[PDB]
């Protein structure tokens, strides 16, 4: 459910995201702006959400939203260099 | 819900937006990116939706999303000059 998934990402609620993923929710669903849970969590600086989505849920690390922003772009723009470092571990090398 | 509102704006569904507004939905509500119905409709070039929100629902014409962009910024960015001129009047 887009609304539940992206608002849980927004508030940093890893416990809810775990319950969603365990019940087979698609953790890569997108809204009308082509935003993912990983975009929203990266923009808010929620390091533990970002790690959970990347490591446990295996989401795409570089989805592009309506403006072609990736989660890495959001982390830099909003000053979350800790999130940036986690995303960097997934780069095309 | 805010997600149903912004999806109706995204698809240009003026009829759904009218039902929502008549039922007392807050047409200025924001999602987790601080986006409004007006932002999404302007980004998509939906002139009828934009006029409905501005003229009937009386929404704020210049809300700022998390990137500090307004609906006018979105219309310009996506090349919707008719929406841009409508918002300019405010
Ligand atoms: Cl604002
Ligand atoms: Na929450
Ligand atoms: Na989009
Ligand atoms: Na990139």
Residue B58 to chain A, least CA–CA distance (Å): 23
Three-state DSSP string of B6-55: HHHHHHCCHHHHHHHHHCCCCCCCCCCCCCCHHHHHHHHCCHHHHHHHHH
Q: What is the CATH number of the domain that holds B51?
A: 1.25.40.20
Cβ partners under 8 Å of residue A93, min gap 6: none
Cβ distance A77 to A45 under 8 Å?
no
Q: Indicate the Cα dihedral angle B46, A8, A44, A31, nearest 10°.
A: -20
Q: Which chain residues have CB less than 5 Å from ligand 1, an ion?
A: B 63-64
Sequence-separated contacts (24+) of A57-61 with Cβ below 8 Å: A57/A17, A57/A21, A57/A27, A59/A27, A59/A28, A60/A28, A60/A36, A61/A87, A61/A90
Closest CA to A41 of A1, A84, A89, A92: A84
Q: Indicate the Cα dihedral angle A22, A7, A30, B28, nearest 10°.
A: 160
Q: How far is Cα A71 from Cα A80, in angstroms, rounded to an integer?
A: 11
Closest in B1, B7, B33 to A35, CB measured: B33
Residue B77 to chain A, least CA–CA distance (Å): 9
Map tokens 């990116």 to a residue.
Answer: B33
Q: Taking CA B25 as the corner, what is the angle to CA B68 and CA B14, rounded to the nearest 5 degrees?
A: 80
What is the experimental method?
A: X-ray
- Indicate the number of domains in chain A: 1
Closest CA to B42 of B23, B66, B65, B15: B65
Q: How far is Cα B1 from Cα B5, in angstroms, rounded to an integer?
A: 6
Q: How far is Cα B21 from Cα B31, in angstroms, rounded to an integer?
A: 17
Map tokens 């805010």 to a residue.
Answer: B2
Instruction: Please tell me what resolution, in angstroms, this structure has.
Output: 1.4
Give the three-class secondary structure for B67: coil
Q: What tokens appear for A62 in the block?
A: 């570089």
- Alpha carbon distances (Å) from A6 to A44, B31, B90: 12, 9, 32
Q: What tokens appear for B77 in the block?
A: 């960015």
- Alpha carbon distances (Å) from A70 to B2, B83, B88: 23, 27, 31
Domain containing residue B51: 1-90
């Amino acid at each position: 459910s887009v609304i539940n998934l992206l608002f849980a990402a927004y508030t940093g609620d890893v416990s809810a995201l775990r319950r969603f993923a365990l019940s087979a929710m698609d953790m890569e669903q997108r809204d009308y702006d082509s935003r993912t849970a990983l975009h929203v969590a990266a923009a808010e600086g929620h390091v533990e959400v970002v790690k959970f989505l990347l490591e446990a849920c295996k989401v795409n690390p570089f989805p592009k939203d309506r403006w072609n922003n990736t989660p890495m772009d959001e982390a830099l723009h909003f000053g979350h260099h800790d999130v940036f470092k986690i995303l960097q571990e997934y780069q095309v090398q």
